[PDB]
Symmetry: C3
Subunit: 432 residues, 3 copies
């Protein structure tokens, strides 16, 4: 009857949380067998192994996906700078996403989820190391290794000269590779119709790897349950992690509720001079079903069906920015990246490092225009920024473990983002 | 007269055995000058050098050839799962090639050619190291280096903890790269007509490198004679190597004669319930000329000219599987890879290592559908598996030195393979 | 009036010498503040840093530009071996460029500019190391690292055995990569119309990177002034460098005047048996304006407007070789590469090493057919050979600092090259 309708539509996002609550069970079973009742680090890695094989070939495809889905994207941008009264919305989308992700980290590293009872050093003139990494030395070595400065001593006229020498270290720099792929993407657009084939090569190449990143997602529930099992063994506690998680769902949703209800409505009232609470009261029902379906793509047509008569928006802007803002202005993911990538930074206690805090915030504004629409789409697109800023990505497991609630909490602020942007632009254009 | 006909048609396979019997001559000449009558390892490498330059740029082209001849191959496979009574032949071709290569190694490492008078250690849970190498971490580092586990000691609560740490070591993993290229090859087929260009890119790219691997083969006779000369110098013996070779031609041909005359005719009689010796007695003459021309491509049309009336095969299956089985069901090469790559393993005494024995047997079943048709075509395609399972490939020289007999011995079992498969399928379809 | 005409046409080659004379000014300002009045090597590198960022992403684009502008070049060569009386001009262009670059180094390392008051070791059987580097082991490791032999000791029957072992060291080998790209370029031409797309891919790919190497050149004047400032600090002298430069402009222009006035006119009189000084006296005015505009592309149409009636050249060869020789026979750059890359070799005192002196001379004959037409075009194309023969490329700064005179001195010998080749071919064809 309806056991074929709902169960087969969102099977995978259902099955991926079936996996982790069963993955923790045999994780509890071996800690019910008790710690390393199985043999030590030479044999236990063989039983955490097919959890690595989700994570290992996940890093394989992000070399095509981050560089070939982005050239074909950035070649089809700027359609003649299409809106004199349209590009201000695109500038609105960027500043409401920076300000989204500004309090993203700025709440979490102020609130410290992860380092509660947990309780070499790098100079902040490693900003040039970030800039030397943006523009890579050559491309083929930039697909697997990246630049980094280590300090050695000279011991000449002073026992501590502390000279920075730069040795290229492993792990790719997709942070320094999407900057190539953007600046290659404008290049072959500017060249024009003679090099159209290179677009038609590349934007078919990502759909040749988006079609196999679907195949990786079907491996994920078998894969996830072996890196949540082999993640609670070496931690040995279960009461500890549900306080590790149990503060993280707080700072996400509080990070949404602070953002969603106040700070973009303050952006509303500073330009609209009307009531945002009279504004969104008409559009509660798409924001109701966006929490239900967890898809701004699915609630895309229902927005114009409601906001056009429940609020006085124009005709042509209902289809002009709101199809854009459903897959471009994604403030909901931009919190969810920005508060997770600093959360995993507090799991392993990497570094405070303000130079990383901007590049954990620029990329989180750049994956925010990335994955979209489908539920649990941000899990892939924050898996590329955890490889960008060299975090240990293997802690993705516990933070898509609770994705079933938090992505539904971010989908509603996602769909809210262009909606208030729609009402803000109509008062800028009808006022004339 | 006929000095232009025969001599110019198979010139290269003639000239490559002219080269090695002349290459051993000045190899005997410097050992007739006596050992290192020339200067030592700093000067003798300069005179073995243009033998390395066959072998060095041989490894260059196997990065395009193994990954671009295989996507364009695997995109044109499964034409709608073309045969309800046809795909059983393709399943027949695989199981008669595994069972071919099963006794491939299983004869040779039971018979030990190479380690007769010759007379760190790795754990057999390096199977995960093989599986961690199948699915690579990223593609660009998978074109030149591969994963491997080394054991270091921890010396904490036990002086021998033996922790496996994994450092990526040099030498590419085409074993882990053709698995990408297959699973990319099904990807852009499944995507359909929108990404047809990526096929039309790639299957023109291999013909842009198959046309220069012809040019490498013309360098080979100049090249071979300087790595058979500089291979018998450091071994210093000539009576030793002709016992090294003189057992290898045995186990190949015995490996064919055990396979060809008994074990697939036992596959015949278990399904046909007729006489295979009454079967192949009609088709001795193509099997006669297949030994002569050493080309299943050349003896491809002569098979239907004989087997269709000398035996009661059907009309449509004479052109349905037998054109397939001439370049797909190649059991003759699949012995010849599988008994050489363990033979070279016994020259350098690498390792017994059952984990390698399956991946010396999976790939030998995968290059068996690879190179075809032309004589001495398996020499290239076993040069890619000697780089797969990290054998020293420079001992290819002495085993194409005697290729002139053994490939003619494997061509006849090659052409035999689909022929008995043709007779087996007709008794499965005419019986109805 | 004319402040918009001249100033906006050659702005960049004006602005790049504005930059260096202002870049030396604050370079003099910090040495007017006196040496390391700023903090030491941990802080001064942060203020030489945006000079590195010209040089760093300069090395980025020379992986596409040297391999994708060269396949699309070498696929469109040999149009049916187009001239029975035309290819002798192309053979003339090569031998007048070797003989140009023969005295290129051969003047400079005989005259020693750079090592005047400046006042491990590698064996000359590192020629095989050059040949082992021409033909690379695999392509993807040839885009960032290259082969090199180091000698270790064996200490067995002699305390100094000096065995050469070969470890691959950093820095790419575009010397060994353009040899692939040529021999790939003939491959897909020979394959014909079926692989036309790979040409149409690649010759659109360089115009997708020639269009961003324009964007690098606009960064260059901001970029240059921070690596001439941070180059005179560690040298601390200003009177020293203007003797370092002040001999270099000598050996260039003397290298042109020896070449231009005598040695190709001796090639003239050995075949023409007429007066070259009666020859070029008619064409002083294009050679006048070639010094002025510093562009053989701009003085391309003015050559046929003068040399066709001021000298008795034919009709059809005026448009047959002289459009070729304006962008192929470039002897002016071939001095300017060949005397700079040995000049920078005498700045850092790298090595005398006759094996390098031919590969500093083969590539300088190969970039001579490279960049063209525009003034200061050789600065890019000698930046790729300084990465070829592993020179420190960061001394490009002081030798485009004085490019404004020397390229105008080489443009006139550039345009002279095919002009005398035009007069030489007409006396070979009208004589019949
Ligand atoms: N990561 C997310 O959940 C993004 C928000 C919403 N689900 C979307 O796909 O647009
Ligand atoms: N390597 C081989 O000789 C293969 C068998 C046969 N010569 C063929 O080309 O099909
Ligand atoms: N590097 C150079 O100046 C080359 C000579 C001349 N300017 C040209 O572009 O052809």
């Amino acid at each position: 009857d309806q056991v074929r309708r709902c169960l087969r539509a969102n099977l995978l996002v259902l099955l991926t949380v079936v996996a982790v609550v069963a993955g923790v069970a045999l994780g509890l079973g071996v800690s019910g067998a008790g710690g390393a009742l199985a043999l030590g680090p030479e044999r236990l890695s063989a039983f955490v192994f097919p959890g690595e094989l989700l994570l290992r070939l996940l890093r394989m495809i992000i070399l095509p996906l981050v560089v070939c889905s982005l050239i074909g994207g950035a070649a089809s941008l700027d359609p003649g700078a299409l809106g004199r009264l349209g590009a201000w919305a695109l500038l609105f989308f960027l500043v409401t996403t920076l300000l989204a992700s500004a309090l993203g980290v700025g709440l979490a590293l102020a609130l410290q989820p992860g380092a509660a009872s947990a309780a070499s050093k790098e100079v902040l003139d490693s900003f040039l190391d970030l800039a030397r990494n943006i523009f890579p030395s050559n491309l083929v070595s930039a697909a697997f290794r990246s630049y980094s400065t280590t300090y050695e001593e000279r011991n000449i006229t002073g026992t501590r000269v502390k000279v920075p020498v730069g040795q290229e270290v492993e792990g790719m720099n997709i942070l320094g590779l999407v900057v190539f792929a953007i600046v290659f993407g404008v290049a072959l657009r500017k060249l024009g119709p003679e090099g159209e084939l290179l677009i038609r090569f590349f934007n078919s190449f990502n759909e040749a790897t988006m079609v196999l990143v679907s195949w990786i997602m079907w491996y994920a529930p078998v894969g996830i349950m072996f890196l949540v099992a082999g993640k609670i063994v070496e931690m040995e506690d279960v009461g500890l992690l549900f306080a590790r998680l149990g503060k993280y769902i707080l700072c996400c949703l509080l990070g949404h509720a602070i953002h969603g209800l106040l700070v973009l409505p303050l952006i509303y009232f500073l330009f609209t001079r009307k009531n945002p609470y009279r504004f969104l009261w008409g559009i509660v029902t798409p924001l109701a079903t966006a929490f239900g379906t967890s898809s701004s793509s699915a609630t895309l047509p229902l927005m114009m069906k409601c906001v056009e008569e429940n609020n006085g928006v124009a005709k042509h802007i209902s289809r002009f920015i709101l199809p854009i803002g459903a897959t471009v202005n994604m403030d909901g993911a931009a919190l969810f990246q920005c508060v997770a990538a600093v959360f995993i930074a507090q799991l392993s206690q990497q570094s405070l490092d303000f130079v990383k805090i901007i590049t954990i915030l620029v990329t989180a504004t750049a994956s925010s225009v990335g994955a979209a629409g489908i539920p649990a789409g941000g899990v892939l697109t924050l898996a590329i920024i955890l490889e960008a800023v060299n975090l240990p990505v293997d802690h993705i497991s516990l933070i898509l473990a609770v994705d079933w609630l938090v992505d539904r909490s971010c989908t509603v602020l996602n769909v809210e983002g262009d909606a208030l942007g729609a009402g803000l632009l109509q008062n800028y254009v009808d006022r004339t």
